[PDB]
């Protein structure tokens, strides 16, 4: 068989390739930014007062 079976055309094939590459780039950038932010927060919070920062509020505010 052949000549077309749930296939696409080259003009649309290249467009789909470019769209997929762009989406993958955006997703990778977002994930890297999120990971960098998480690492920064972990480095800044691991110094001290890990649970006290929330305990003070749980004691002040309504539990």
């Amino acid at each position: 068989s052949g000549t077309g079976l749930g296939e696409v055309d080259v003009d649309t094939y290249l467009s789909n390739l470019q769209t997929k590459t762009t989406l993958s780039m955006i997703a990778d950038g977002l994930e890297r930014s999120a990971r960098d932010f998480d690492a920064f927060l972990e480095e800044n919070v691991t110094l001290e007062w890990e649970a006290q920062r929330k305990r003070i509020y749980q004691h002040f505010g309504i539990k």
Partner: protein, 177 residues
């Protein structure tokens, strides 16, 4: 263009990021001289109108960049002078659809949270006003945290709840009572 501005915005994030790894940075300084930080904070107004969609992904990189500048000690000086507190007030911004809503609040909370705890006691005066002027809203988030889409939504609540908590302990709102 819609794709050029997006790629250009994300590109600046990599430049400033890799520069810090190399307490100051020449990349962030150049942006201030070119009036980039000024116009950038001005665009923060009316963000609700802008916010898969091309406009949504563009705003993500925008707020993401500002968050990086608020991590270095020198950024608080240039960023604070831009009067960002008055820019985010005119906009009145303060299962999958809801998840995106909290994503915007988290991005803004992180920029403000990191900015106050960057310089020192010179910005705590502004942080207290933000919590007092917008009191109650944060209380609902801090109490909420205390299938796939559900876990994603709850995850943002944890980050949003912990975002304000960092500003409280860093600003010293407990002493004000």
């Amino acid at each position: 263009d819609t794709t050029c501005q997006t790629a250009a915005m994300i590109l600046l994030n990599a430049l400033v990021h890799t520069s810090r790894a190399s307490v100051d940075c020449p990349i962030i300084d150049a942006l201030n001289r070119l009036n980039f930080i000024g116009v950038l904070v001005d665009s923060l107004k009316e963000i609700l109108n802008e916010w898969a969609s091309p406009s949504q992904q563009y705003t993500s990189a925008k707020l993401a960049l500002l968050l990086q500048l608020c991590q270095t000690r020198q950024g608080a000086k240039y960023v604070l002078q831009a009067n960002l507190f008055r820019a985010l007030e005119q906009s009145g911004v303060f299962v999958v659809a809801l998840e995106r809503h909290y994503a915007l609040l988290v991005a803004l909370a992180r920029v403000v949270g990191a900015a106050v705890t960057a310089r020192g006691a010179h910005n705590i005066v502004q942080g207290r006003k933000f919590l007092t002027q917008h009191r109650g809203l944060v209380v609902h988030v801090l109490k909420k945290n205390a299938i796939l889409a559900q876990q994603a939504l709850e995850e943002r609540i944890e980050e949003l709840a912990e975002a304000f908590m960092l500003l409280i302990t860093a600003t010293g709102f407990l002493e004000y009572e």
